[PDB]
Scaffold this active site. Structure first.
Site, PDB file in Angstrom:
ATOM      1  CE  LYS D  24      -2.354   0.702   3.786  1.00 39.06           C
ATOM      2  NZ  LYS D  24      -3.341   0.394   4.855  1.00 39.06           N
ATOM      3  CB  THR D  25       3.947   2.248   1.818  1.00 38.89           C
ATOM      4  OG1 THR D  25       4.705   1.059   1.562  1.00 38.89           O
ATOM      5  CG2 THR D  25       3.332   2.155   3.196  1.00 38.89           C
ATOM      6  CG  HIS D  84       0.091  -4.764  12.986  1.00 38.72           C
ATOM      7  ND1 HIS D  84      -0.232  -6.103  12.920  1.00 38.72           N
ATOM      8  CD2 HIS D  84       1.248  -4.622  12.297  1.00 38.72           C
ATOM      9  CE1 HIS D  84       0.685  -6.741  12.215  1.00 38.72           C
ATOM     10  NE2 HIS D  84       1.594  -5.865  11.825  1.00 38.72           N
TER      11      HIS D  84
END
Lengths: 203, 77, 80, 393, 67
Positions: D24-25, D84
């Site tokens: 995603k980054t 998380h």
RNA sequence: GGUCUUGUAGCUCAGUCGGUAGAGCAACGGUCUGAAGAACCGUGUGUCGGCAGUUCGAUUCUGCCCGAGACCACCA
RNA sequence: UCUGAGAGUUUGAUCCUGGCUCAGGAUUAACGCUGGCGGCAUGCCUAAUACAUGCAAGUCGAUCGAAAGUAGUAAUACUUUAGAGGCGAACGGGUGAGUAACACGUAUCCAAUCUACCUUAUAAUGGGGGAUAACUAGUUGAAAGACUAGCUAAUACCGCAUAAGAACUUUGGUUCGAAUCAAAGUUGAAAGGACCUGCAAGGGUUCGUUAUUUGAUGAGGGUGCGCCAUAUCAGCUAGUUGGUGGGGUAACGGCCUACCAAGGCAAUGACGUGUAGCUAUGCUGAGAAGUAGAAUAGCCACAAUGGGACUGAGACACGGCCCAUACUCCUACGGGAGGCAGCAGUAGGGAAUUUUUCACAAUGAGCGAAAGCUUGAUGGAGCAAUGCCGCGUGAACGAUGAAGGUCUUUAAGAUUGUAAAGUUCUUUUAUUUGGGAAGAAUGACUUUAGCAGGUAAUGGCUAGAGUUUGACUGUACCAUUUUGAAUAAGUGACGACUAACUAUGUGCCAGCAGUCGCGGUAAUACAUAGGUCGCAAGCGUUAUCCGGAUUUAUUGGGCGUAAAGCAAGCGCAGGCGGAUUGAAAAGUCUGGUGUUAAAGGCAGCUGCUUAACAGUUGUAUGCAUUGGAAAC
């Protein structure tokens, strides 16, 4: 507060009638003493200079309706000149614009005079004011913005109202001038100088 | 800082050099006069003294004072 | 400009540009009131002529206040 | 001047929804790079993906960060949603304020409990027609593994109430796309065309005066405090009067600067990632996550009774029952304020599912209004969701 | 807020201090305790007095009663 | 905003191997002081901040939060 | 003219002596409840703590070259300045740590001084040379910058002749360290620009410039005077008290040096500590006086700390420079950048001190013939009940006293209370309509009209024409401008001290309290309710000041027993001193002359609707001089 709110309560406590002679004679229960339930008999054990000064201060303050800051500043303005401060102060007290229009007789109550003057319906020397305490000079002409002549309350006030020698007025024109200073006998005698100039330990 | 400040500095370097050069020649002439006293050297010295006093480089008063002190040593000699 | 907000007033006084306004002055000449019109302006022209003769003049608009007065037409002869 | 910025194109906020290690980054970096090579004024950013320590040192999202980028069709913002637990408040912070959330799932990192919970929370709070993007396909090329994930994402999207059969699926590789392998730009163009279609916007209306959900507070040297958020309704110009609302007594304030991403606005909009400088205020009284409105008509409240859509335990409801003393975290459009489920006398333990009508008491006076959708969560699991039916006090 | 440590008196019914709270200090002269002359001002942003304080609500920091 | 910590009688404070609630004080009564203090005997009290599990078995071990207490937010 | 109060508090009870408390104002106030508007004041008192960014110092092409660009085929005209040069860059602003002395203010003297431009008056503006810019190129580094070579202008620089006047000294002359004079040597002034007229030769105007003289202006110095406490502070002190020569500053001056002496100050208070920016003034006050030295205006200091120096006419220079120091920061490792006590404004400290608002529209300043430019000065705008003042929150009518609430405490009744209800009238403000200021009653500006010099024509002094400059403003304001009693009172206290009582509750617990002290089981002092009185968009409550407080008594106390006569004597200085004559006035009183910034207050007037407030006129005070009276 700018105004007294209720009036008959104070006059009951003041023991003086701001009106001509009568404010109440049979209202369900008439009394010549303080109102409320505590007023069974409390006027014969409060004889003191402090009480007299406060009572008379309220009497004259309620007689015209001037707030304490304004009341103080007006006395200082009276101190400005030397003259005779007693009669000078009394003449200044009656020289208020609402008192002027009350003595020429276009208002039934000073509260009504104040309300009428505040709305700007009273024109003073071609320049109206919104302060209902104007200090005048001998020879001042008034007129009431002749539309407001058709007022039923003003009509019921001014038909045969207050007639005074020190002020010339005509109800056929609702206009007049301030001829001279009123005499002390023509003013309420329940008001004295000594007690309030004493309560004037400030100045 | 201001651009005018840099304008002043770049200009005043040259005039500082001019002032120190003029002071050096005044001092050299003063030392020459004190090496041997005569009106010949003093005429010159007073000439550039007046020229420097023409501007604000040297105040006219200090020059009058030193010139009076020099004419005194002329007079006693 | 002194007095009250929205009420301009300008005392007429001999001043020089080396001192700020409403600081220290030399000598009073009068007062100008631009707040209310119809030519409110009083002048002395007693030592102001001397001040004009010795420089260090007051502000420039004051010149015009003596053009209507007529000091200019009589100053040149004093000037020359 | 503060480098004034203006734009007239519609603004659709798009995020990368899904757990970390999905690329995603890398996807956020890759979209910026490809639109740098596709559109003007699209300056590159890889060290600016995040702005906090341990945000970049790990390479996988932990805390919030904002990026801005425009295409030749439409402008977009993006907030970096976390991974998380112990940071889910940020994701819903984003999840409340996006209208476009690309499901960046990985074929090698197939949907994890964090990702499934992200999709379920998108259903609970409402993310319209959220699109999916298979990612990190550079690893483990298989005949059918790439397709079982593609069918199961459709199944899970149709398993909550969304439209998993009305969404095009485009795969890709995060590292290959970011590095600049030519064949992977067609897929990011397909993704951009996918967020062009069936992705609505917060409706454009200036008639609504004001409302904004605060996301972060940043004090600026010399200026004061520029508090940032997302506008739910209303348009904003410099010099207007406003009132702060939420957990604190309502106080008036004046705007003095409006910004996209530290670039000053000309006209704010609902859904825009806005930042407004406020005079006379410090972080002590303006809270990170408060709300704000036009002065005159807004009321905070503590207690209110609403119809709650109890989500079934198989659909994602609570693991067990609850009594009156149950205290889950309510989510109101800007903040997790934790209340209590004060069960009306229906049964001793209301179970997940079988949507009920319950009254709730909250410690803090927060702005409430009938019909406003709110969420109910507990420690990373949603236990309810609904809208206000009656506001009491 | 300086190093000075002073004894003081809490006026009104009850108290709302929890051993770690900041509040404002006032003077005055009470003669029921030697030395003790200062008192705590209630209703200032931390400890607040809200006990039907209808009359004399100026001190104690008590809000005006609602209609 | 995260990093942890705390929740015991009415108050301040320890908590049996999940298996038991323990002190002082205000505090109820009695002895006693012209009276009030001071002193001495006995009383009392907790369903251990609230929900659900693990659980013969939870204040106690967890998941949830809340009231509160401390650790920092660089860069440049 | 001015100009004045007390009351309570010792005890079993009385008085005196002294103490204590209350009652007046007042803020740079803060703070609690709350709050409608308007004028005005005022808005970091803490950390002279540090601080993103931007503004606060530019102007001048009629000072000069060159260059670009526009138009023009081109010639040429036009905009602009990177630079050079001119002026302001010292003021303008903020702050008060430091600074107890010439710092302050006043009175002088500077026979010990300076002062560009602005004023008077006058002689010159002749001649040449030289380079640096800019530019071209190279070196140098990421950068700031720095270095090197070739080519340029002047009203920038330097010589060259001239010298009314001026420079020195010398001789002669005059006057009470000096002034006026004649003469003998010597020195040194530059630059032109624009325009007009003139074929030219030249002439004319203006600006600019050298020189000289008049001023004023400000700057510098000295002087007594009075302005903190501190003897549980007694010696201090050597360019220090001096004298001799020189250097030196604008200038006297141990200012400094070479030399020679040893003084000087101090007990009438040096020195020492702590504290302070000063004054007018602000406040208290009746008054002698006290307090504060908000803002504000005059004086001084200062610019992160400490030094050094240039320039400017004047600086050791709030937005000049260099360096050290400390901080912060860039940094690719080699170097560097900065100083908000300039406008804000932020961090933090507090109980607390205002917006990165507008316009240079006025004014003022700075620049420039000129258009024009800059002004966070200034003139406005917003926020704040921080303070003063003005005004609304309706009015008139309207009784057995509606309901209700309270008391009497049932079963009459009274109380809130014409207050309510109900009826009319009116709309400061609130809501709408239309118009609308002054400030621009200064000024350029080109054409007119007249006017000084001289004429050949420009240019300059004054009136007339307008272009005209408005953020504020569709603002102040104006009007049978619509609607609407509608849009608007809280608040301390009731034992007394000092106007303000009943009920219920608690039972020396809870609490109040400035004072006496109330409360331990009917509390007029606590808790609540009602009633009541006080002030009011304000009401209270804390700090500091003074009145009271005569409570250090100048006025205006005393010292036998309430507080004190040293245990006593001798006595220096000093203070107070017998009578009569004279002198002058050092005091004393008094006349004149000057100052005593404005401003503050006072008395009078004017203006904003009156107000508040502002402005206008006069009003003191101390000394300096001169002139009188001579009682003390």
């Amino acid at each position: 507060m700018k105004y007294t709110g209720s009036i008959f309560k104070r006059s009951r406590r003041l023991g003086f009638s701001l009106l001509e002679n009568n404010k109440e004679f049979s209202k369900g229960k008439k009394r010549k003493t303080i109102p409320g339930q505590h007023g069974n008999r409390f006027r014969s054990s409060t004889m003191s200079g402090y009480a007299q000064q406060l009572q008379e201060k309220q009497r004259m303050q309620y007689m015209y309706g001037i707030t304490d800051k304004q009341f103080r500043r007006l006395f200082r303005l009276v101190l400005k000149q030397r003259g005779n401060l007693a009669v000078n102060l009394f003449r200044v007290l009656e020289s208020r614009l609402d008192n002027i229009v009350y003595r020429m007789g276009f208002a039934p109550t000073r509260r009504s005079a104040r309300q009428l003057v505040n709305h700007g319906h009273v024109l003073l020397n071609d320049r109206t004011v919104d302060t209902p305490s104007i200090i005048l000079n001998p020879g001042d002409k008034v007129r009431l913005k002749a539309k407001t002549i058709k007022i039923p309350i003003v009509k019921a006030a001014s038909e045969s109202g207050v007639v005074s020698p020190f002020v010339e007025t005509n109800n056929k024109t609702f206009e007049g001038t301030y001829v001279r200073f009123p005499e002390r006998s023509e003013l309420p005698a329940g008001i004295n100088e000594s007690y309030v100039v004493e309560w004037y330990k400030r100045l | 800082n201001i651009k005018s400040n840099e304008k002043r500095l770049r200009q005043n370097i040259k005039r500082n050099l001019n002032n120190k050069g003029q002071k050096t020649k005044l001092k050299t002439n003063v030392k020459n006069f004190h090496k041997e006293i005569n009106l010949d050297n003093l005429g010159n010295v007073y000439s550039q003294a007046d020229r420097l006093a023409r501007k604000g480089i040297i105040s006219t008063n200090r020059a009058r004072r030193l010139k009076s002190r020099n004419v005194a040593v002329l007079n006693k000699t | 400009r002194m007095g009250r907000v929205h009420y301009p007033t300008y005392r007429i006084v001999a001043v020089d540009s080396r001192v700020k306004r409403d600081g220290k002055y030399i000598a009073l000449i009068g007062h100008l009131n631009p707040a209310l019109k119809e030519n409110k302006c009083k002048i002395d022209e007693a030592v102001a002529l001397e001040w004009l003769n010795k420089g260090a003049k007051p502000t420039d608009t004051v010149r015009s206040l003596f053009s209507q007065t007529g000091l200019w037409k009589k100053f040149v002869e004093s000037k020359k | 001047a503060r480098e004034k910025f203006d734009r007239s194109k519609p603004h659709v906020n798009v995020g990368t929804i899904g757990h970390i290690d999905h690329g995603k980054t890398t996807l956020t970096a890759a979209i910026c790079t490809v639109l740098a090579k596709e559109g003007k004024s699209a300056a590159t950013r890889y060290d600016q993906i995040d702005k906090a320590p341990e945000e970049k040192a790990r390479g996988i999202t932990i805390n919030s960060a904002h990026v801005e980028y425009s295409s030749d069709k439409r402008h977009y913002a993006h907030v970096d949603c976390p991974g998380h637990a112990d940071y889910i408040k940020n994701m819903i912070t984003g999840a409340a304020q996006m209208d476009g959330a690309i499901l960046v799932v990985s074929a090698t990192d197939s949907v994890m409990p964090q990702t499934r919970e992200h999709i379920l929370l998108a259903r609970q709070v409402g993310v319209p027609r959220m699109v999916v993007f298979l990612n990190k396909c550079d690893i483990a090329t298989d005949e059918e593994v790439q397709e079982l994930v593609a069918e199961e994402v459709r199944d899970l999207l149709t398993s909550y109430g969304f439209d998993g059969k009305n969404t095009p699926i485009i795969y890709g590789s995060a590292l290959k796309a970011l590095e600049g392998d030519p064949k992977w730009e067609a897929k990011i163009h397909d993704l951009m065309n996918a967020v062009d279609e069936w992705i609505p916007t917060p409706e454009r209306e200036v008639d609504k005066p004001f409302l904004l959900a605060i996301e972060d507070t940043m004090t600026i040297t010399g200026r004061g405090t520029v508090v940032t958020g997302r506008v739910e309704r209303g348009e904003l110009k410099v010099g207007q009067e406003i009132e702060i609302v939420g957990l604190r007594p309502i106080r008036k304030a004046v705007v003095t600067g409006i910004e996209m991403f530290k670039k000053e606005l000309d006209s704010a909009m609902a859904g825009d990632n806005a930042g407004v400088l406020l005079r006379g205020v410090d972080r002590k009284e303006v809270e990170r996550g408060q709300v704000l409105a036009k002065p005159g008509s807004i009321k905070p409240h503590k207690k209110f009774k609403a119809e709650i859509y109890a989500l079934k335990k198989e659909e994602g409801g609570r693991h067990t029952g609850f009594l009156n003393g149950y205290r889950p975290q309510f989510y109101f459009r800007t903040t997790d304020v934790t209340g209590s489920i004060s069960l009306p006398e229906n049964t001793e333990m209301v179970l997940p599912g079988d949507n009920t009508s319950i009254t709730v008491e909250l410690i803090a006076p927060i702005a409430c209004e009938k019909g406003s959708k709110f969420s109910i969560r507990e420690g990373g699991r949603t236990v309810g969701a609904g809208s206000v039916t009656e506001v009491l006090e | 807020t300086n190093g000075f440590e002073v004894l003081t008196y809490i006026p009104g019914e009850g108290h709302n201090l929890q051993e770690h709270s900041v509040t404002l200090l006032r003077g005055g002269r009470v003669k029921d305790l030697p030395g003790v002359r200062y008192h705590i001002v209630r209703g200032t942003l931390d400890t607040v007095g809200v006990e039907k304080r209808r009359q004399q609500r100026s001190a104690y920091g008590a809000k005006k009663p609602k209609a």
